Write a protein that binds this ligand. Sequence first.
Ligand SMILES: Nc1ncnc2c1ncn2[C@@H]1O[C@H](CSCC[C@H](N)C(=O)O)[C@@H](O)[C@H]1O
Ligand SMILES: Nc1ncnc2c1ncn2[C@@H]1O[C@H](CSCC[C@H](N)C(=O)O)[C@@H](O)[C@H]1O
Lengths: 207, 206
Amino acid sequence: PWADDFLAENADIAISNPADYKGKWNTVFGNDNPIHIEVGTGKGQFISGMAKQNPDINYIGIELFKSVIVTAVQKVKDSEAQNVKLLNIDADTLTDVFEPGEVKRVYLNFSDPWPKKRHEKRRLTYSHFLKKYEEVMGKGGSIHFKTDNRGLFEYSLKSFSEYGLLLTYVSLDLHNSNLEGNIMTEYEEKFSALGQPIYRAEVEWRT
Amino acid sequence: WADDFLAENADIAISNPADYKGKWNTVFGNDNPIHIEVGTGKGQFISGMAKQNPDINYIGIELFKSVIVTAVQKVKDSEAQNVKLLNIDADTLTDVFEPGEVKRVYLNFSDPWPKKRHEKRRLTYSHFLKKYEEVMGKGGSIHFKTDNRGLFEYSLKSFSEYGLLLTYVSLDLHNSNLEGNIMTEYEEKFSALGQPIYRAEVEWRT
Ligand SMILES: Nc1ncnc2c1ncn2[C@@H]1O[C@H](CSCC[C@H](N)C(=O)O)[C@@H](O)[C@H]1O
Ligand SMILES: Nc1ncnc2c1ncn2[C@@H]1O[C@H](CSCC[C@H](N)C(=O)O)[C@@H](O)[C@H]1O
């Protein structure tokens, strides 16, 4: 039972035309709380938790795989969170969806590592996407990155440094470094069970 | 008192390094690049890198004379002539080298000084980052490896805040194949129990 008409019925959580609201996302939520976005909201357990945890922040999740954003809309439907919208769009469309400074933070969780050299350009921490984040947040923004992948994290650290961003937080073992209020992602729960360390970085723009 | 073998081996352990500021090419006899290690220890590292790379001039610094003696002995057993050693504190680096005279600085398993009041004693603190810039110029780099998650985590932020560019970073050095890697004494000990060894390379922006 493949369900795509499901996303049309819940068009109040899954905005089927997000480009229309560029510059006007404050009207979409009804308040001017800061908008934080997650670029890879696979299954929406994280975004839902951060919403319930922080009612005074407006969360917008982005997902490319429609097979999995469906699960995300269901978690937002169950959590009854009213400060969560979801976009089934590609990260390259960020500048068509948000005006500079409309976004205040970007959350990156367990993104695809694309280990091969030819696929650096597809990594969500590559300078192309680093630019897209600068273009929607301005220089008053930050990136909150967590991943299990040593390769992707190692690369991301260099990529942040090369782009000129300031490292304000870095953990090389998140579940042994006490972080108050940490919402685990689906991928975080599984690789945590595996006893593998989870890396976390906070990176922000210089001003 | 006494018990110093350093006077007899004054050709490896330079007992007056401030005299040679600006003139270290005369101390070696060539213009091979000068790499320095801060916090040498028993000298296993500096000796290995010297024998491995005869075309680089290595100068190791150590504060405790009890342990630099072991370092001069390892340099004595190896036949490397491109190793000098200084029994001095990292602060006097600007009294020993002219800007641009040093090309790289090696930091291995430095003291972490975990509590906040002793941040200023850490060898990756902005004070020392300046001292390294002042002896290397903008053409220098730092090659840091340590077992300490705390110190590495801090150092990465410290490098970023100071404005240095991260060109290499390993969060598991013995699973990331590094070809020219010479293990330090402390590296061998913390390698036991499989603790991960972190490594970073940072260089100045231009
Ligand atoms: N360019 C892009 N735009 C949007 N989503 C993307 C993307 N590239 C990858 N993704 C999505 O990002 C997710 C990363 S894997 C799942 C991560 C999730 N935070 C978790 O921890 O469970 C995948 O669902 C993938 O399809
Ligand atoms: N400011 C300073 N100047 C010089 N040496 C210092 C120093 N602070 C600490 N040290 C020395 O640096 C060493 C740190 S322990 C590391 C030993 C060696 N690098 C190894 O990896 O095996 C100790 O010998 C300590 O006494």
